[PDB]
Design a protein around this ligand. Structure first.
Ligand SMILES: OC[C@H]1O[C@@H](O[C@H]2[C@H](O)[C@@H](O)[C@H](O[C@H]3[C@H](O)[C@@H](O)[C@H](O[C@H]4[C@H](O)[C@@H](O)[C@H](O[C@H]5[C@H](O)[C@@H](O)[C@H](O[C@H]6[C@H](O)[C@@H](O)[C@H](O)O[C@@H]6CO)O[C@@H]5CO)O[C@@H]4CO)O[C@@H]3CO)O[C@@H]2CO)[C@H](O)[C@@H](O)[C@@H]1O
Ligand SMILES: [Ca+2]
Length: 420
């Protein structure tokens, strides 16, 4: 009874909190009326906590504003569920208020009140709530547990079932509400694109979808690239292709990844997920908030080099030093504006990470959000195995994750692709 694609035929929510921040920047009015997702990054964000990250609007305030904006016609608001126990286990920049052992509190003081509020809007037949479930959670249990280079926190979250059971609980509690559409976060191609990571991620998604009373029928689809920068399409780069009889996959940038962009990744992922037992009508989302890679530095065509790495590096639109460089990435631009069904199997391009909100602080900044100083957000950091022992690529003088970052907003605006 829920619509196939909740973005289809719908007006899109404009978050007034974000809109005001965008409009206050030089040239920011050009994007101030775009739809961005609303993040519930703390228990306090549910009622409203006047924080730097969520401002003066609680969940009810947003849903009332969504109803108002709808005019009685179909409208879609995106709400990010982002407060797992031991959240962001492979990093420090967005660790949170709930520790690894606090699944019970996640259920009773976070998910339950969110569900209670959303239930109150069930009588608005034209309001559609897209619930984006727990960014950078499940994929960590594949890539940052055991072996070398992972974390003890991620190992513990796998061991104690906190991520798997928390996600399942969110899926059931929110998915049983008639106008709620759940999308599971599915990392990005530069995270789980590799053979070693892809299949096990599909397995962990299926596990979570069946945990805490959930089934795959609570899962409307999946979202990739949330708060990341991976290209939607690399127009001048073929992952299967060859340069001078040599595989593109052998390049330092691709480094044996099965994919070089988000679109091919999600399309294949969709097929794998259906094969595993997810609904055949699932649709994918790609967060295009910061992946346009436009401006003067954007390649205008394929390189003419017959050297592999020169061809790859001159031809790629994603200009990062390494695909593992995730924080406040220098030179990034706004991507495609939110768009319904842009490609086969894709429900929408969306702006989930709100442009201008930081990925993390570039230094130690005292806070009560549970957030630490991650050196991947330090411009001077020389990296680690994982990122290929490379400079971080992070913008300097960055505030705490989710806080307003004027410099980043202005560069994103400048480097928008397609052009504004
Ligand atoms: O403003 C709204 C709210 O924002 C919140 O903050 C956000 C924040 O913006 C966001 O940045 C963040 O999420 C990031 C995580 O913190 C971070 O840990 C994660 O890092 C990933 C990385 O993206 C990925 O590329 C990397 O992939 C690795 C992979 O793990 C590894 O297996 C693979 O290994 C291969 C080798 O590279 C290769 O040599 C060999 O041959 O094969 C190997 C495979 O077998 O390598 C790749 C590449 O290095 O993994 C790391 C994880 O370790 O990235 C996330 C973004 O994608 O946190 C929040 C949500 O995103 C605020 O907190 C809130 O207040 C605001 O409201
Ligand atoms: Ca669908």
């Amino acid at each position: 009874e829920k619509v196939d694609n909740p973005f289809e035929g719908a007006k899109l929510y404009v978050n007034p909190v974000w809109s005001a921040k965008a409009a206050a920047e030089p040239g920011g009015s050009a994007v101030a009326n775009e739809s961005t997702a609303v993040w519930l990054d703390r228990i306090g964000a549910i009622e409203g906590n006047d924080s730097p990250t969520t401002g003066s609007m609680g969940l009810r305030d947003h849903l009332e504003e969504a109803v108002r904006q709808s005019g009685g016609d179909p409208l879609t608001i995106q709400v990010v569920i982002y407060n797992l126990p031991g959240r962001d286990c492979a990093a420090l920049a967005s660790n949170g208020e709930l520790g690894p052992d606090e699944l019970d509190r996640y259920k009773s003081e976070y998910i339950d009140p969110i569900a209670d509020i959303m239930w109150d809007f069930a009588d608005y037949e034209n309001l559609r709530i897209v619930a984006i479930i727990e960014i950078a959670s499940l994929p960590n249990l594949v890539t940052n547990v055991g072996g070398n280079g992972g974390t003890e926190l991620c190992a513990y979250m796998k061991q104690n079932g906190g991520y798997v059971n928390g996600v399942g609980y969110a899926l059931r509690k929110l998915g049983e509400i008639p106008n709620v559409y759940n999308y599971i976060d599915a990392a990005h191609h530069g995270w789980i694109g590799w053979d070693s990571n892809f299949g096990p991620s599909v397995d962990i998604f299926y596990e979570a979808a069946n945990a805490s009373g959930s089934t795959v029928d609570y899962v409307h689809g999946f979202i990739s690239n949330t708060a990341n920068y991976s290209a939607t399409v690399e127009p001048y780069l073929d992952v299967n292709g060859t340069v001078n009889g040599q595989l593109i996959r052998q390049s330092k940038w691709v480094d044996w990844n099965q994919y070089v962009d988000e679109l091919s990744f999600v399309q294949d992922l969709r097929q794998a997920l259906i094969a595993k037992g997810f609904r055949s009508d699932i649709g994918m989302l790609i967060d295009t908030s910061r992946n346009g890679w436009g401006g003067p530095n954007r390649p205008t065509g394929p390189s003419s080099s017959t050297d592999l790495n020169t061809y790859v590096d001159e031809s790629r639109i994603d200009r990062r030093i390494h695909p593992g460089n995730w924080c406040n990435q220098a030179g990034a631009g706004l991507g495609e504006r939110p768009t319904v069904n842009p490609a086969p199997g894709v429900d929408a391009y969306v702006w989930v990470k709100p442009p201008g909100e930081s990925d993390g602080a570039s230094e130690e900044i005292p806070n009560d959000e549970g957030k630490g100083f991650d050196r991947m957000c330090d411009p001077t950091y020389q990296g680690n195995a994982r990122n290929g022992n490379n400079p971080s690529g992070a913008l300097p003088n960055a505030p705490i994750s989710g806080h307003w970052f004027s410099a980043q907003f202005r560069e994103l605006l400048a480097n928008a692709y397609p052009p504004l």
